[PDB]
Amino acid sequence: KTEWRVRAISAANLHLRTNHIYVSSDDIKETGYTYILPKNVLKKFICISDLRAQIAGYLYGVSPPDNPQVKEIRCIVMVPQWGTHQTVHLPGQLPQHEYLKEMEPLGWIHTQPNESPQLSPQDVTTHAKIMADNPSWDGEKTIIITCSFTPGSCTLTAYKLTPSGYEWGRQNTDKGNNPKGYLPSHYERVQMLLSDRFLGFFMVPAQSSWNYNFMGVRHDPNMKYELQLANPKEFYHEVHRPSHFLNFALLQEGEVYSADREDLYA
Amino acid sequence: LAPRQVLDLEDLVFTQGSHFMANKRCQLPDGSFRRQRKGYEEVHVPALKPKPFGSEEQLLPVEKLPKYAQAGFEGFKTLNRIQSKLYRAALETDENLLLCAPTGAGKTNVALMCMLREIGKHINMDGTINVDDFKIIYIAPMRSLVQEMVGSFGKRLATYGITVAELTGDHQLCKEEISATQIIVCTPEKWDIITRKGGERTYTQLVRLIILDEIHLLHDDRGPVLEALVARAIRNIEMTQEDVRLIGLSATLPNYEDVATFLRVDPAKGLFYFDNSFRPVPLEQTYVGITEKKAIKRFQIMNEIVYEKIMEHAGKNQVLVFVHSRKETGKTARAIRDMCLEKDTLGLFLREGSASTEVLRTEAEQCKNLELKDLLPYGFAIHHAGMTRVDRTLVEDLFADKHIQVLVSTATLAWGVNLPAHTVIIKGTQVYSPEKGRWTELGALDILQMLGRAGRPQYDTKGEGILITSHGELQYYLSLLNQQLPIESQMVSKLPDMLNAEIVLGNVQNAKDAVNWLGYAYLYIRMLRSPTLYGISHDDLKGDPLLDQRRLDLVHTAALMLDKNNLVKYDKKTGNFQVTELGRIASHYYITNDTVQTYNQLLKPTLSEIELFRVFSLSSEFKNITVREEEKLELQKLLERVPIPVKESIEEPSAKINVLLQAFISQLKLEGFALMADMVYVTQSAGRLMRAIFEIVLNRGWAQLTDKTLNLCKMIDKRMWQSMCPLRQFRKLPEEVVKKIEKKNFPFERLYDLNHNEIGELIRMPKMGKTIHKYVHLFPKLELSVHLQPITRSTLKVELTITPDFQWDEKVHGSSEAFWILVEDVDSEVILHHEYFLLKAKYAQDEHLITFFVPVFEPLPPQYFIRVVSDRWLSCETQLPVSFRHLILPEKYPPPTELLDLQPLPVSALRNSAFESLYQDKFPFFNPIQTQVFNTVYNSDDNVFVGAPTGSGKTICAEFAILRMLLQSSEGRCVYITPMEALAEQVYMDWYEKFQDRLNKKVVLLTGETSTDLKLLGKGNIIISTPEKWDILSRRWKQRKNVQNINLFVVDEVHLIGGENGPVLEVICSRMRYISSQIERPIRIVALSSSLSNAKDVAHWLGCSATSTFNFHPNVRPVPLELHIQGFNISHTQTRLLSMAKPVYHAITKHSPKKPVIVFVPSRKQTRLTAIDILTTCAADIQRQRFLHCTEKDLIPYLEKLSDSTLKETLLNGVGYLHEGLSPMERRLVEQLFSSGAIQVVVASRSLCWGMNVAAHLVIIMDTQYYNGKIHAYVDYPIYDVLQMVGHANRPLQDDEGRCVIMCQGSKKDFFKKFLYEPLPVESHLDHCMHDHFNAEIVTKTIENKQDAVDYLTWTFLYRRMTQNPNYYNLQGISHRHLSDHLSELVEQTLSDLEQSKCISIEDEMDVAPLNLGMIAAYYYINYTTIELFSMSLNAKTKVRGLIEIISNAAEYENIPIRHHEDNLLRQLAQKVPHKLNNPKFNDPHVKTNLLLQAHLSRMQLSAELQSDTEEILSKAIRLIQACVDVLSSNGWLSPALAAMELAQMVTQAMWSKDSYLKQLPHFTSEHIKRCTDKGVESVFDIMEMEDEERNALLQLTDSQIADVARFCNRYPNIELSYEVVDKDSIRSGGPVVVLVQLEREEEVTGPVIAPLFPQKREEGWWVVIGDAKSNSLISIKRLTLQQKAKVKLDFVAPATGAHNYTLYFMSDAYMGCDQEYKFSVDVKE
Amino acid sequence: RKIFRRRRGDSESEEDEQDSEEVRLKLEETREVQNLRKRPNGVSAVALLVGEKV
């Protein structure tokens, strides 16, 4: 469609949402862990997002010394992906790299087109599938952070899956908006904080780019990729949409009658 | 400072530009008639009769001019009339000229005559031209004319060996273009923008001639460029007093005398004006003016007008028709062909085949593939830009042979190629101007050039020209073509931009300077002549005859306009101007101030590509661009196909500009003429506009927007999106191949891995695979690797190694490739540091190292990103993450010692009465630092460390320690160490006059020689030495008892451990500590240094307690320091230096107007250059000799002592300069003048900062960067040199504060303040210079095994600093185990290196023992690498030719300086030396020292710098040669040892071995040798013992000149020896053989050897050698010094054979011809 | 008795160009080995990526 232009124009103004970021305050249980997300990576992750299509990124971090309850998030890993407004499709292979062996997986963060009072069934299904496929993701350590786009700002909330949630999500095969057997008891909300005390970093695929929304046919759930230390490109970067730049008939006799003036300063 | 009123410049400007006619009525020649037919009326002006030749007037034959000018005029019988008139003024006088002649009269040949004059000023000798002595600038209005000028001048001036070239290209392409060529042909805009960028700065002194071709362009909108250029040139002529000749070529138009006045042309001599009667071919111009109003009929009329005019000349004259646009050419040709064919078939004779008399050639040439195929058979043709290159030359050649009867063309034909025609018809005269945004009449210059082609010079009696135009514009062309259109100035419109350019260049500093600058503009002359035309009333003119007030008002308005747009900071009060970054960028890229304001408002860090295109579209250069109704469907269609979205409606002009630029980059096809013109205009401006945006964003440090802007600049340049395949940039690839390559979803980086077969198969076509592979490996590519080491907790030192990884091709990559080095933070949002990197073709596939400092912060970032991005290649970036995960920042350092507020200490505090007299007169009280430290230093006996900024009287603390030592013992021994020899001499004279006189204590200064040092140490009480001399002396401290028993060891400037030559100081200090450990009588150590951040480490290393460590903050200095830093953002160092000359003078005026000033410059020549520049800049100002503070008469006696002519001239004007080449007497005299106050400015080179004792008020450090030719790069000053330079600003008595101005690149500005306002951290570099000291300790048996080496390293400052800052020393941990492992690895690698070079021997794996190579390396204090080189290269057959090379390759010469332009001198020298060098690298210091050694041996004459380098080389030559002799003797080879001895004895005398022995006699030349040779004398003895009368008869000279010659023979070695074998009869095989040699000289020694051509004072050295010549074996050798008599015994083992003979050699090292040899035999028994 | 070293260089016995080339070769290879002995200052980037081996 030709509607990507208005979306690109809107996404060019995502740095304005960066100023106002609201962390949801709730009835915390304070029995499990608490997670600290540095503001710089959140700012960049919002800036590279799109209002209509969700993007996702794996969370990697470590617990600081003599304080195991808190979990500092140190890295956000962007992987080849293509997103729908209600779900994000990302490959089965979890990111692996020498730089990430020291740290541990803490979950994944994804943007959301609109504010939702409850965690979407697609998110719990995806998290349960990831946990089932990979034993490295602990049931209680991993979380889901949803960064909804409120009017003029963005509110982000963390969630955790109960064992019943894992049990239901692993066997779930329905991609509908309201699957059967889904109840709020599956997930629990987890306290999280933003901080400027420390800085995080990004990791992006070594080959090509992390975004396959435009080149959808090239994305296959079984694809393999390698990571690197680099900052991600914006959603509507030129690299991400080659079908708009590459295909162009190169003129030969177009310039035969081109107007002639001398570039004196050249 | 008048009451300025603001004038609106928009009112004053002449609208409609070049079409403004100040002419009132335009009366026309006598023959004329206006007749009307149908819708128009014609005006005819008959051709003027040529002016008859005057009396005694005749054309000049070519043979009648100077002989050198004869070449360059071949093929011409005679000069024409105009050239005949002008040849005298052009060739004989060096006077400014203005030639006003009708077009086509041969003004280019007059310009050629002026160029030949300038060339003849350099005829050199033997018919050669000094190519590098001059440059000529030829300014031409059109590029198509520039190319033809280049071609023609290359053809004409070929025989002179002179290269002419166009100036087009990138600035760094033009930088190497200009240096290559001698004649530069360029447009006014190109030359102006190059001058604005500063690219003309380097060669501006070589420009002697400037030619302003078609100078009547002043009337055009481009005229302000000419005014700026000429005014700048003339004003610079006045400013620098240099002479530049300006030649102006113009058409015959009114106000020519005003142009002559503007060009500084004398009307009586240099003004030549010729009317239309002097045109070579009479021209019967005809005008037609159409009165039709509606466009369709008016255009319909013109067709039959051209047809009717064509039919007149149908069968007899080649008609040439011009059309406005490229497409109109074919349309007009087809229209005229159809019109002539359809009616009555006029084409029959219009072609006139005459039964194919001529048509056959065109019928043969019909085999084309264009629309020219249709027209050519009928005789018509079209010539326009485009077509094909072959088609244009085909049509040109076919027209030159009178085949094409009618040729319609565009305006480029007239400018490009000289193709005259009998008749020319100008059709339309209405062109579309994209800048104006509408249809405008075409320029006057174009009309003149196009109508100057009417009539062929020799085939035409008279050629007419028809001009077709609207009747409303007929009078303008009547005026223009009949020399009645005045040349007016257009400067008012562009005044603010040119004023900003002048401010940025630094030419104008305030309003007065701007008024003076306007005084030279053509606008000023025009306002003077015609005030009423320029809005000046006659009474206003009477008010001020010189128009001072009006010029000031104009300047005030321009300054206000610039200030409003933030281009300049201008205050109305003083009228001063301050350059802003926006102003600099606008000047460099030639953009108007409104565009700069728009960019400043709109640009933001968070800008995206959409808003970037929006910002570009909102530029003010496009203010006249509007969207038209007809070009709306096409714009709408293009809107969907462009990639970047546009958030504006199509009706706005900004959206049109944006989508148009995108369509250009996307290479879309456009079908509108106006649309295509707009596209061409916007895209040609886009280069400069986007480059300016990129510079702005880069300066503000916005990384994310910087990347986008640079990529967009590259996309506009290459006309392709970055997503496309990078191989498109090589235009040789087929389009299909690249399209297929990028069709596959493919990463470009994968192509590197594949070979040529896989690349071909991968594209499903193997035949192209090899070419694709070649082009892939031609693509630029760099490999990055960083070794960063933390300096302090807030800064990191990063060295980046860039290694090219691509095959270099001259045709593709050009002379050089440019890259941008960017380091960014984690988020890639801010640029921490950036710098321009230029890769040279000759230095390709060489590793380049770039060192810079980046800051860090408390929230330690996870990593930094280092990006190296190509300047003009897409997808040519390399990124290297620099992780900080395992970085260990250095220890946090404790605060400096607090200055206790104590009452000043009286000198009477010292109880002893004798000491008080030393300081009683100097001062009554010790200053606060000395008072605070006094108790500890004077009264306590413990080690003390004093750290204070230089100039705080730290030496008095050492004096306190010395006086304390004197109290301890009546006879004491103190050793004072200073890293610099010059500082050592300064301290020596001070302490000598302080102690040896007042206290009568022995104060001595150590020299290089060892025995003299031992004697001085034995007799002296206060030892003064450098680290190297004391290291030599104290290496064998176990042998020398005097070294052990020293009471006090004072080390000064101990912060220089972190600098070069620091490891020696560290080693000697550690050795003193270790020695004091074992003596059982502690050696007190007093360490004096600058403020150290880590003074605790130094105190711990040297044993100073915490309470006796005084580390003071740099603000404790008694004289407060006012330090200012200026940043000059010029990547080119030469350009930076040249441009920063005037700022030095401005700083002198502002900070120290009447107080002494010291200027520090990097190089030796820069001293003289800067002195001359300061003199010329103050002379250009009103006040001359302001710096001289005394009458010349009293300083006259000082001049005759000087021997430098240039220095004499500068001294008379109050400015001196100091450098190494000056003799010590001259330097001390200039310093005496500076101290006395006679002169207040000295320009000292960087190296002299240590060895200079003068105090000033203001110290100016010019560049803080020097050239290292060994690495062909620039390296900044060490921070210690900067500290020493800054410390010279201390004048405690006269001054109350010390100013210091540090000028440098913009990048270093942040580092300088951080490390100059705070205490300095010092590290250790002993881990790199470890081999020599370990070798020395192994030789002296201090280190006997590996554990000894580890324990030895436990005593160093390196051991202390390894734990404090581990990552600086490549240590990955702080644990004790890590330190032990690293130390063991270091002492393992060093011992392995020594064992590999045979310096030592490692038995088993623990013990180490010295070998002979190590012993001779330690003996002569020579780097072990040099000894290894000698051992590996010397063989049994090396002769002197190889010895020179081997000596040249020693590591002692590794630091011989390499300077700019020395390659030419080295090549010229290598051409002359007796031994040539096979393919030598001229940036290699070893090649240079080989050449200098050969030149010195050949007594060749060299420049002063090369002479000083020769002195430096010869200083170490003798030690190196003695080392070579020892190596050869150890190996047992005899012939090369004798060769080395001869090499020594002939380097001393500076002669080759083949030269006559008598050459070493003083005042002897070849003629004297020639006279001596025939007489039969060949040796010095044969005249030493010869008659005085005969010797003075054969030698003709003054008695004074022969007295020293006779005395030389007295000093010449006259010795003889006797030898005997002790019990030669009782000699058995394998037994010891003792041979005794006794030599007594006869004449007594009167002094040292007489070697006038040698730097140092040599001493008689000898060699006694026993060997067998037959076997070429050196049996024994012993080196000695002979005083008056000597005895030498040589021992060896007798061989098995009973009978053996040996030849006893006796060689010298200072004299030649005194070597003796004797033959003896030994009788060996069983 | 007073015999001197009469010089008979004979233009170094027409010194061979190859002999000088061999001396240059030996010097170049030795200097290359000596340059190979040089150690680097500061920690490399890859070292900070990997840190301690164990």
Numbering used by the authors:
A (entry chain J): 2070 to 2335
B (entry chain B): 403 to 2128
C (entry chain C): 5 to 58
Sentences from the paper on this structure:
For instance, the U5 snRNP 200 kDa helicase (SNRNP200; Brr2p in yeast) unwinds the initially extensively base-paired U4 and U6 snRNAs during spliceosome activation and releases U4 snRNA and all U4/U6-associated proteins, necessitating re-assembly of the U4/U6 di-snRNP and the U4/U6-U5 tri-snRNP after splicing. SNRNP200 comprises an auto-regulatory N-terminal region (residues 1–394), followed by a helicase region (residues 395–2129; SNRNP200HR) composed of tandem helicase cassettes (N-/C-terminal cassette, NC/CC). Both helicase cassettes comprise dual RecA-like NTPase domains, a winged helix (WH) domain, a helical bundle (HB) domain, a helix-loop-helix (HLH) domain and an immunoglobulin-like (IG) domain. Only the N-terminal cassette (residues 395–1324; SNRNP200NC) is an active ATPase/RNA helicase, while the C-terminal cassette (residues 1282–2136; SNRNP200CC) is catalytically inactive and serves as an intra-molecular regulator of the NC helicase activity.
We have previously characterized the interaction of SNRNP200 with two splicing factors that are also largely intrinsically disordered, FBP21 and C9ORF78 (34,35). C9ORF78 is recruited to the spliceosome at a later stage and has been found associated with spliceosome preparations enriched for the step 1 spliceosome (C complex), regulating usage of alternative 3’-splice sites and other alternative splicing events. Like TSSC4, both proteins also contact the SNRNP200 CC. Notably, the binding site of TSSC4 binding region 4 (residues 303–318) overlaps with a binding site of FBP21 and C9ORF78 regions at the Sec63 unit of the SNRNP200 CC. Moreover, all three proteins employ an F-R (F315-R316 in TSSC4; F8-R9 in C9ORF78) or L-R (L369-R370 in FBP21) motif to engage in similar contacts with the F1983, E1944 and E2119 residues of SNRNP200HR. This observation supports the idea that the SNRNP200 CC serves as a latching point for diverse intrinsically disordered proteins (IDPs) that either function during snRNP assembly (TSSC4) or during different stages of the splicing cycle (FBP21, C9ORF78). Mutually exclusive binding of the three proteins to SNRNP200 may serve to prevent premature interactions during U5 snRNP assembly (TSSC4) or support ordered recruitment of regulatory proteins during splicing (FBP21 and C9ORF78). FBP21200–376 was fully displaced by GST-TSSC4 while, due to an excess of SNRNP200HR–C9ORF78 over GST–TSSC4 in case of the SNRNP200HR–C9ORF78/GST–TSSC4 mixture, a small amount of binary SNRNP200HR–C9ORF78 complex eluted from the SEC column in addition to SNRNP200HR–GST–TSSC4 and isolated C9ORF78. These observations indicate that TSSC4 exhibits a higher affinity to SNRNP200HR compared to FBP21200–376 or C9ORF78 and prevents binding of the latter two proteins.
